[PDB]
RNA sequence: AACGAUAAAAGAAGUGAGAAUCUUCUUCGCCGUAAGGACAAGGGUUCCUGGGGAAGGGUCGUCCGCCCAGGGAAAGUCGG
RNA sequence: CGAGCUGGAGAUACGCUUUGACUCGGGGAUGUCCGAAUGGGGAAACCCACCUCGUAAGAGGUAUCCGCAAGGAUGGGAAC
């Protein structure tokens, strides 16, 4: 989520997580308008993890370029 | 003074038992999904088919027994405690309700 | 790109009676075209689509109060298949 | 109502310590604090018990008389009181955790 | 005082806590280069389904173009 | 800082926290569309492009004024 055991990934598998939570949340909305969603926290934490990706790679564009 | 009453119901008259209540209530309950008159199959079990099924029917049948029980006798009974039992995939359903 | 452009599912009675032959419909974001979404519904599930539409869809709604009413705009897309009768399990719903 | 900004955002008590009640009803009534917050400044002690009744429109056979719940309070009590008398905080010691301060008056235990 | 053109109404059936005034039926009448129908500007979601009844409706109101929930307008060729 | 938090409207459930959450300090990164806005157009938030980099997506450039290597500039400020 933040440890050094995550930012070590390159720009191939690390970016794969970006489109991993967006698609997952997509199958969570259909249950919100059908009465099958019983995990309100499945959205809060999810979106919170999505931000823990585009922020890391963004740091690899200033610390290694100046 | 503690007495526990029980009942054993065969899976013979349990399936159709819900098929008449589920479809029966659906023709009355107001669901934003569809209008009161047409119901698919795989939609009601997703809307309230979680705790508004075996639970509602259970509390409904039991309440009827206590209600009519006071209409045929006319004497308030004592205090009883109903206990919710785990529901199976669709077979014999038993329960245990005792009291003082 | 493929999983993007979304909004909310559909559950009417007409959107279902027609879904029996192969007529799906999934809402989309307040901003989307027809060419970009076309390749976001086929590569999302795995089937070719012919028809697809998308346009602003407002809906003023409220209860009580003097705080006006909000206008929520959510475009809707009604795709269609040629030979594909089912995709996964959403058709047998 | 200033959101009860009279005092401050902290609390001189915890949610697992023994706190009594005074300057009110039931004198010398000891108990344990459960729920409490610095915002609206509310305290839930197992000592002060107030019989209340809940009202529910229609939730699958209502049937609810007068249940037994607790009542929230304010800074009308004294937290950490074992010397059979109300005290405060003025002795700060340490053991093996230099990341947490201690409280004491003439004893040392808490 | 007035309840907003002197194109009127009647009965039966139903509903309901309660109906002259809601519904159904069958009659009566009035418009018919219109008091029919289709567009444009303009309004905005008033539309349809189920509910409701304080307020608006110059009486009632169980009804509404009133209040709430939901749903409803998918065109390479009609307009732009 | 510290053992609570999950905004006002306080309601329901799921959850976030003693491997130091919330909150307070203070820096960073994201920053749709409009708005001098300056890509071109335009009844503000709408329409239409072109080029370069490139798996799709996606990113950046694209007014005019003075010097014309950098850079600065025409907009906004109650009152003074």
Curated annotation (Swiss-Prot), chain A:
Keyword Metal-binding tagged: no
An example Gene Ontology biological process: translation
One Pfam family linked to the record: Ribosomal_L29
PROSITE patterns associated with the record: RIBOSOMAL_L29 (PS00579)
Gene3D superfamilies: 1.10.287.310
GO molecular function, one term: rRNA binding
CDD domains according to UniProt: Ribosomal_L29_HIP
Oligomer status and interactors: Part of the 50S ribosomal subunit. Contacts protein L23 and trigger factor when it is complexed with the ribosome.
Listed PANTHER family: 60S RIBOSOMAL PROTEIN L35/50S RIBOSOMAL PROTEIN L29 (PTHR10916), LARGE RIBOSOMAL SUBUNIT PROTEIN UL29C (PTHR10916:SF0)
Identification of the protein by name: Large ribosomal subunit protein uL29
The species this protein was found in: Deinococcus radiodurans (strain ATCC 13939 / DSM 20539 / JCM 16871 / CCUG 27074 / LMG 4051 / NBRC 15346 / NCIMB 9279 / VKM B-1422 / R1)
From Swiss-Prot, chain B:
Location(s), subcellular: Cytoplasm
Covalent S-S links between cysteines: none
Stretches assigned to coiled coil: none
Domain comment (free text): Consists of 3 domains; the N-terminus binds the ribosome, the middle domain has PPIase activity, while the C-terminus has intrinsic chaperone activity on its own.
Sequence similarity: Belongs to the FKBP-type PPIase family. Tig subfamily.
Function of the protein: Involved in protein export. Acts as a chaperone by maintaining the newly synthesized protein in an open conformation. Functions as a peptidyl-prolyl cis-trans isomerase. Probably changes conformation upon binding to the ribosome (maybe in particular due to interaction with L24), exposing a hydrophobic crevice that is probably important for its chaperone activity.
Subunit structure: Binds to the 50S ribosomal subunit via interactions with ribosomal protein L23. Also interacts with 23S rRNA and proteins L24 and L29 when complexed with the ribosome.
Annotated protein name in UniProt: Trigger factor
Source organism: Deinococcus radiodurans (strain ATCC 13939 / DSM 20539 / JCM 16871 / CCUG 27074 / LMG 4051 / NBRC 15346 / NCIMB 9279 / VKM B-1422 / R1)
Recorded name of the encoding gene: tig
Span covered, complete protein: 10 to 109 of 465
From Swiss-Prot, chain C:
Alphabetically ordered keywords of this record: Ribonucleoprotein, Ribosomal protein, RNA-binding, rRNA-binding
Gene: rplW
HAMAP family (UniProt xref): Ribosomal_uL23_B
Protein family: Belongs to the universal ribosomal protein uL23 family.
Signal peptide start and end residues: none
Function: One of the early assembly protein it binds 23S rRNA. One of the proteins that surrounds the polypeptide exit tunnel on the outside of the subunit. Forms the main docking site for trigger factor binding to the ribosome.
UniProt GO BP: translation
Cysteines engaged in disulfide bonds, as pairs: none
A cellular component annotation (GO) from this entry: cytosolic large ribosomal subunit
Assembly and binders: Part of the 50S ribosomal subunit. Contacts protein L29 and trigger factor when it is bound to the ribosome.
Protein name (Swiss-Prot/TrEMBL): Large ribosomal subunit protein uL23
Superkingdom, taxonomy of origin: Bacteria
A molecular function GO annotation: structural constituent of ribosome
Cell cycle found in the keyword field: no
Swiss-Prot record, chain D:
PROSITE patterns: RIBOSOMAL_L24 (PS01108)
Source organism, top-level taxon: Bacteria
Annotated Gene Ontology cellular component terms: cytosolic large ribosomal subunit
Claim: Ribonucleoprotein is one of the keywords in the record: yes
The keyword Chloroplast appears for this protein: no
Coiled coil: none
Any one GO BP annotation for this protein: translation
MF-aspect GO terms: rRNA binding; structural constituent of ribosome
A Pfam family: KOW
Keywords in alphabetical order: Ribonucleoprotein, Ribosomal protein, RNA-binding, rRNA-binding
Function: One of two assembly initiator proteins, it binds directly to the 5'-end of the 23S rRNA, where it nucleates assembly of the 50S subunit. One of the proteins that surrounds the polypeptide exit tunnel on the outside of the subunit. Contacts trigger factor (TF) when it is bound to the ribosome; this contact may expose a hydrophobic crevice in TF.
Quaternary assembly: Part of the 50S ribosomal subunit. Contacts trigger factor when it is bound to the ribosome.
Family membership noted in the UniProt record: Belongs to the universal ribosomal protein uL24 family.
Protein's name according to its UniProt entry: Large ribosomal subunit protein uL24
Organism of provenance: Deinococcus radiodurans (strain ATCC 13939 / DSM 20539 / JCM 16871 / CCUG 27074 / LMG 4051 / NBRC 15346 / NCIMB 9279 / VKM B-1422 / R1)
């Amino acid at each position: 989520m933040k440890p050094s055991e995550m930012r070590n990934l390159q720009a191939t598998d690390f970016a794969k997580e970006i489109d991993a939570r967006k698609k997952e949340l997509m199958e969570l909305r259909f249950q919100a308008a059908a009465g099958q969603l019983a995990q309100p926290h499945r959205v809060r934490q999810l979106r919170r993890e999505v931000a823990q990706l585009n922020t890391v790679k963004a740091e690899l564009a200033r610390k290694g370029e100046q | 003074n503690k007495v526990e009453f029980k009942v054993s119901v065969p899976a013979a008259e349990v399936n159709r038992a819900y098929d008449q209540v589920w479809a029966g209530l659906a023709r009355d309950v107001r669901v934003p999904g569809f209008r009161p008159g047409k119901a698919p199959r795989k939609v009601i079990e997703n809307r309230v088919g979680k705790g508004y099924v075996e639970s509602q029917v259970r509390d409904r049948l039991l309440e009827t027994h206590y209600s009519q029980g006071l209409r045929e006798l006319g004497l308030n009974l004592v205090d009883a405690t109903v206990d919710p039992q785990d529901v199976q995939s669709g077979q014999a359903f038993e329960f245990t309700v005792k009291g003082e | 790109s493929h999983y993007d452009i979304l909004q909310a599912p559909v559950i009417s009675e007409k959107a279902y009676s027609a879904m029996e032959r192969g007529v799906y419909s999934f809402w989309v974001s307040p901003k989307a075209t027809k060419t970009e979404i076309k390749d976001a519904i086929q590569q999302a599930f795995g089937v070719r689509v012919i028809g697809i539409s998308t346009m602003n869809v407002p809906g003023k709604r409220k209860r009580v109060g003097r705080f006006i009413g909000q206008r929520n705009d959510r475009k809707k897309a009604i795709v269609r298949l040629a030979e594909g009768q089912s995709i996964e399990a959403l058709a047998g719903q | 109502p200033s959101a009860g900004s009279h005092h401050n955002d902290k609390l001189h008590f915890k949610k697992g310590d023994t706190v009594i009640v005074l300057s009110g009803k039931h004198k010398g009534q000891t108990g344990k604090v459960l729920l409490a917050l610095p915002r609206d400044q509310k305290v839930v002690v197992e000592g002060v018990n107030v019989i209340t009744k809940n009202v529910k429109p229609s939730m699958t056979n209502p049937q609810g008389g007068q249940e037994q719940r607790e009542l929230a309070l304010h800074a009308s009590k004294v937290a950490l009181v074992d010397p059979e008398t109300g005290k405060a905080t003025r002795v700060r010691k340490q053991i093996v955790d230099g990341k947490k301060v201690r409280v004491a008056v003439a004893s040392g235990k808490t």
